[PDB]
Amino acid sequence: SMEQVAMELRLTELTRLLRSVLDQLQDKDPARIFAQPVSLKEVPDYLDHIKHPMDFATMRKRLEAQGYKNLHEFEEDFDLIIDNCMKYNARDTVFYRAAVRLRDQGGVVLRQARREVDSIG
Template sequence: MWSKSVLNAKCRICRRKGDAEKMLLCDSCDRGHHMYCLRPAIKIVPAGDWYCPDCKPKSARISPRKVVRTKSFSQDESSEEEEEDDEEDTEESAEEQDENDSISSIEEVPVKRNLTYKIPQKPQKKGQKPSSAKKSTSESRRERSTRRNDDTPEKSNNRRRATGVWKDLASCEEILSELIKHKDSWPFVEPVSKKAVPDYYDIIKKPMDLGTVHKKMKEVQYPTPTEFISEVDQIFLNCHEYNESRSVVAKAATSLQIFFDTKLGKASISHYRAPVHPTKKRRTT
């Protein structure tokens, strides 16, 4: 029982103990999950049995094709019974109808109206003006040429840049999700609490955390990857400015920063990083 208690359980997501009041145990696999580590986060302890995302029972869905097939089979059976009843009546009048249909098909010929035929044009002599069709083709060619002239190299480059930026932002979102799932991201997932660290906001003038970066990414507040990379770098700068280099938090920041740099290099977006000016380190007493 002690191995399955809330006090001894480790969170399956952040792999850490603690916060027993905010720890949930799955009623199926008995694994611990912090309420704030779940996505979406749970603020209130659920009543009754609770199952983790891996143990939730999946409801079976009935495909619409099966329903349509059952309806079609029932309709086919009813239609077959009606056809058997009407076969005897239709056999007698089949010959008469064939004769009448053949006569009506000969007499009533459908008239097609508004038909367009292409008449071959005669070769024009010298001195004659071109036809309207040739004028329209020449005008369309001129419009195409003007559109091509309007597409200057600057505009085409801007379009290419815009499409490239959206692809790079998508890779930034993937890197952010991997940063949050990293084992050393636990000090940087949420903002620093004023109650736990009263003098933090007196020293750090630009506080930032991965949760705030994730919120901005979902709200599309980053026009380019440059702003995203600068705010993630600000997290590491704040950590090294406030904490000592031998502390656990500073070591976690160093490990996470190396992981972040390698991911930027693999995604080929490290060129978006703006030059970082060194800040004064905190004096230790």
Template sequence: MPKGRYLGLIKDYDGGTMMECYVHPSVDFARVPEMLRYQRAFLEDRLRRISRSHVVYPPLRDAATYLAGASRGQEAAARLLQIPGVKEANWTLADLVASLGANRDADRARTSLRTELLQVVRKIEDQNFAWPFRQPVDTSEVPDYLEIIKDPIDLFTIDKRIRKGEFYKNREMLRTDLVRMALNCKEYNDPNSTYYECAVNLEKYLATVFT
């Protein structure tokens, strides 16, 4: 902005950078809301030409009438296919059967992994050296624990993570937490303590479980 435009009209601060707002003469700023409405209508019209996302379908009334001819294994897919809008989105019965089958396989795999990991934790809990690891460390008894151990872990927390079903994707992720549990114990406790000895025994046991 040329200095002559503002000199004597507004305060000039040392080191300040003057800025101006330019009002374009061809834009009627009093009609901005109206212009935005026209722009929105234009965009919605173009979207309707290439998409059916604006279509609202009626609810499904009687699914049973659509299951004729579908095998027992295909009933779920047949029901989905009759949801208004599914066919219009180019889904076929074969597509839905394949999708549902993949989901069932994934569910079975998650259930199998959860069972396997829980068995590992149960076996560790049954060991004589497991008592320091069964519950989170009580920081009211050891106030400085979290200052030394930045990433605490214990069997109770691990059990909750397994049961939730989304945290551990494989055995190696569980092993990582269990190893860290032993390392935390060794880091915080004196090498001559019973706690340290339990951590060493845990490490030895993990070496036999994860081979």
């Protein structure tokens, strides 16, 4: 149907915007602390601590299968990145501090993305 097609075009346009949001968020992590999943080889106990791991590569795979239906879903995954890190790592660590900075800086980007997703429908 033409209705199905139009909905598909909306998903595609959302996917384009989310891709640019994702690149912008990831620039706020120049150390690449959040680039890839935490290694279970190097943190074998990780899953006893963190129930839903997340990282920018895993977000990117989901995005390219057009797997975010809305901005809320994408933000949930971004928040997991930050929130997982601030629980597993202590306050006085380079990891925790990188999460705080990503959160603060990413908030600006997400504030306007929310306006762009509302605005362009």
